[PDB]
Write a protein that binds this ligand. Sequence first.
Ligand SMILES: *[C@@H]1O[C@H](CO[C@@H]2O[C@@H](C)[C@@H](O)[C@@H](O)[C@@H]2O)[C@@H](O[C@@H]2O[C@H](CO)[C@@H](O[C@@H]3O[C@H](CO[C@H]4O[C@H](CO[C@H]5O[C@H](CO)[C@@H](O)[C@H](O)[C@@H]5O)[C@@H](O)[C@H](O[C@H]5O[C@H](CO)[C@@H](O)[C@H](O)[C@@H]5O)[C@@H]4O)[C@@H](O)[C@H](O[C@H]4O[C@H](CO)[C@@H](O)[C@H](O)[C@@H]4O)[C@@H]3O)[C@H](O)[C@H]2NC(C)=O)[C@H](O)[C@H]1NC(C)=O
Ligand SMILES: [Cl-]
Lengths: 208, 190
Amino acid sequence: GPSVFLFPPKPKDTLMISRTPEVTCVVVDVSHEDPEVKFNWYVDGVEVHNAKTKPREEQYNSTYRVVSVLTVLHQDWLNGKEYKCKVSNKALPAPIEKTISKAKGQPREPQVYTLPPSRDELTKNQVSLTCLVKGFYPSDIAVEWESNGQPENNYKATPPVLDSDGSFFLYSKLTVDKSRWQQGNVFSCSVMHEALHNHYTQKSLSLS
Amino acid sequence: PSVFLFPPKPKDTLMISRTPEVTCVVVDVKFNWYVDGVEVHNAKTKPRESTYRVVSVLTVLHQDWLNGKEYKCKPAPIEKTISKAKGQPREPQVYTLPPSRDELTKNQVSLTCLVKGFYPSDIAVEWESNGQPENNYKATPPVLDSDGSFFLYSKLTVDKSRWQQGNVFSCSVMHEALHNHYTQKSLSLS
Ligand SMILES: *[C@@H]1O[C@H](CO[C@@H]2O[C@@H](C)[C@@H](O)[C@@H](O)[C@@H]2O)[C@@H](O[C@@H]2O[C@H](CO)[C@@H](O[C@@H]3O[C@H](CO[C@H]4O[C@H](CO[C@H]5O[C@H](CO)[C@@H](O)[C@H](O)[C@@H]5O)[C@@H](O)[C@H](O[C@H]5O[C@H](CO)[C@@H](O)[C@H](O)[C@@H]5O)[C@@H]4O)[C@@H](O)[C@H](O[C@H]4O[C@H](CO)[C@@H](O)[C@H](O)[C@@H]4O)[C@@H]3O)[C@H](O)[C@H]2NC(C)=O)[C@H](O)[C@H]1NC(C)=O
Ligand SMILES: [Cl-]
């Protein structure tokens, strides 16, 4: 019989009102002999109709894959509403239902601190710019580096880490060529989190 | 009944004064122990403890473990084999970072130890001051960097007054690619 997987929206899509958060319901192992699939979508028990279901696509193991995409309201997701995808198929004894919702917890506001390279690293060709984000809850977050209106993507974040007061922290490390740091270029750490005013704050870093 | 074989704590393998051990835990009893096939006899088996658990502890030689030797613990007998994670060692660089000026508003400040460029991921990072291990720090797990080496960050939280008073804090790093498997970097207001 078919199997169902329900995927949440990207955190950043839920946090930035201009972006498009979606819940995605995927169905696999749909047989040739019972190929039709019906999706029903519910937000807190109430059925919604606006979903966009894609036509079935045959896989290399002669089974079909069918995907339905529900556009969500940012506030609905952040208010903890449950999204249910019910999948119907004639090979199933009963319809398969899957429910998901935002991680629970009292929100806490992160503090964002930029830290320049250690003097000892200035011997090297590349230097590390550090963005400490601490005190946030829950763990869903987006941390990004940029300079002069361009994303800097030679960076890596640690996963969120549980701190001694029950909040999370993480560190994001931006690696840049030493000359760029010495030349006086401004680098910025953008943090996106539900407990921030407007879900956004930015802290900048440049050589003195 | 099932068998679990646990490696030594990385720090025990790295500090020659410490006592690294391989631990063979059997749950729900004879033990045979082998180092690269060759049987060894020095293991110390504990007495048993609504199912029984029995544990045998083998003392290992630091250099044997770091040289990649395999440790084997034994309807039919169950065998389990373990050894050190493989990979060309790379030396970590250790950098201490003081608190951001913006955090100096707060009652507690964050002291940061960046350790980067190390391989493999086994490591020990610890904070201390005035001959005492510091209370209240947390490290991130190792993270895979864009050049294939790992990095991590260790955050020490201290009261602002301690930072302002001029107290020295030290980040100790223990890793196989370091000379003597040890390096220390200090951080203070001055
Ligand atoms: C017949 O074929 C179909 C189709 O498969 C394709 O075609 C075939 C022919 C072949 O070529 C395949 O190679 C093709 O892919 C088969 O369909 C597959 O069926 C699987 C179930 O049997 C199903 O597996 C499940 O996958 C779940 C989803 O997780 C996977 O995908 C993630 C993608 O990311 C998503 O989520 C993140 C959020 O974190 C989001 O950012 C993304 O945008 C996206 O929405 C992966 O992240 C994830 O992990 C991979 O990647 C990470 C790194 O990111 C890495 O660390 C991992 O090692 C992985 O590589 C997954 O891969 C998954 O949740 C689910 O788990 C369930 O079960 C476990 C227990 O095992 C349980 O603990 C969980 O709670 C959970 O309930 C499960 O693994 C495949 O998704 C599906 N394939 C497709 C394309 O839809 C079909 O099975 C087959 N039939 C046969 C042989 O009979
Ligand atoms: Cl020692």
